[model samples]
Target: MSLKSDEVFAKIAKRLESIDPANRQVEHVYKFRITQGGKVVKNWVMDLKNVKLVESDDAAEATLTMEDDIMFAIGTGALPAKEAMAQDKMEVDGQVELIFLLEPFIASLK
Candidate 1:
């Protein structure tokens, strides 16, 4: 089944509740898209923490590039980021600090 951006955002919000802001403070641009039966349906950018969604394309460095399903799974505690990375379910791009910063947040969701 395909997932919607709103549903994905809801899951992200739930996961965010468990995160502690002290350890990491960084902005990230999340691009979400779904391809079902060769038809592309949705695309969205989630401006995490205090970052606005509108500023996603200003040549700013991105922490990762991941799909909606992997994000939903990660947010809902159905999959671990490390495992997802290992399984090639998600593609991460940009600096290493981003992953290091994001690790705690991912851990908190579980």
Candidate 2:
């Protein structure tokens, strides 16, 4: 039940499609700052601003910043994102409150 991907955008896109139709309340333009060994390997921007549904780096509502392994664990259900945050394993900046918008999407990845 692990959903790890070098190209994560596609999974996000699919998750968006699934949930936005059910509830756009969680729909958003997001940026994920995934890192490894203290280096940022991917800072992805999901283009919900224009409703174009793409990935890049630019305007976004907030950022999910964490190490890549932690992210994979979250996506894989090996670790809960909230638990990671409570343990300081991940960091959500810009608007931590808005991070809940992605909870369901993240869960689906499991």
Candidate 3:
């Protein structure tokens, strides 16, 4: 079976693209680093200002890093985001409020 992480980024991009930029009023950007075997597997910039998820090394308010399975688990709703953060399974650096801001959107993904 295909991992949910495979579609998670694209799904979020499509969802953001469908929304009108005016209503979003979001300007925060964040980089997501998914790693496997101690190496980064993918990188995505969740640029809310531009209203798209792009695989670019853009500067962001926060940098979120997680392992491959953790990403798949979180993306698929198999694990709660809060729990991951609390357990240190998901690591966030820089402005953490950005994560709180993105929580609603993440919840909607479930």
Candidate 4:
């Protein structure tokens, strides 16, 4: 009765890929722990290296942990990332600096 993470992430993969014309080459592994009702229901990894986007369920260097609704709100820009972070609705680990590079890619979801 809520958003499907697989569908959402699949679209994000394409969104990131289409914006790669600038060859924004960066190497990193981003993990996502998607939860609902205080339980983790799904997980994902966004692997970025060789100038491409690969979404999977692999291990990662960084993790973005959030609930399904919170994740959806962020993707839709109904809730800004900063606000979510401030509210403790989201958590980021590992190479936190790399998050800055995802602006365009994330904005594409909205």
Best model per lDDT: 3
- Candidate 4 Cα deviation (angstroms), residue 56: 5.0
Q: If both were scored by lDDT, which would come out higher, candidate 2 or candidate 3?
A: 3
Tens digits of per-residue lDDT, candidate 4, 3-107, equal 556556666666665654555455466778888866777776766564334546777777788888888777665677667888888887777677655544465
The candidates, ranked best first by lDDT, are 3, 4, 2, 1
Candidate 3's displacement at residue 6, Å, is 3.1
Clashing pairs in 1: none
Candidate 4: RMSD over Cα atoms? Answer: 3.3
TM-score quality measure for candidate 2: 0.72
lDDT of 1 by residue, 1-110 (tens): 53643565666666566556685656565554444433445545556645334323334344444566666676666777778788777665556676646666655532
Q: Give all candidates' CA lDDT scores.
A: 0.56, 0.66, 0.72, 0.67
Q: Candidate 1 or 2, higher lDDT?
A: 2
Per-residue accuracy of model 2 over 47-84 as CA lDDT, tens digit each:
76554444477867788888878877766556788889
TM-scores for candidates 1 onward, in order: 0.56, 0.72, 0.78, 0.73
lDDT (tens digit, per residue) of candidate 3 on 1-110? 33346577777677666675356545577788878755777777887667777778877788888887887777766787778889888888887776767666675432
RMSD of 3: 2.9
List the candidate 1 regions with Cα displacement exceeding 4 Å. Answer: 11-43, 48-59, 107-110
Q: What is the lDDT of residue 94 in candidate 4?
A: 73
Instruction: List per-candidate RMSD values in Å.
Output: 4.4, 4.1, 2.9, 3.3
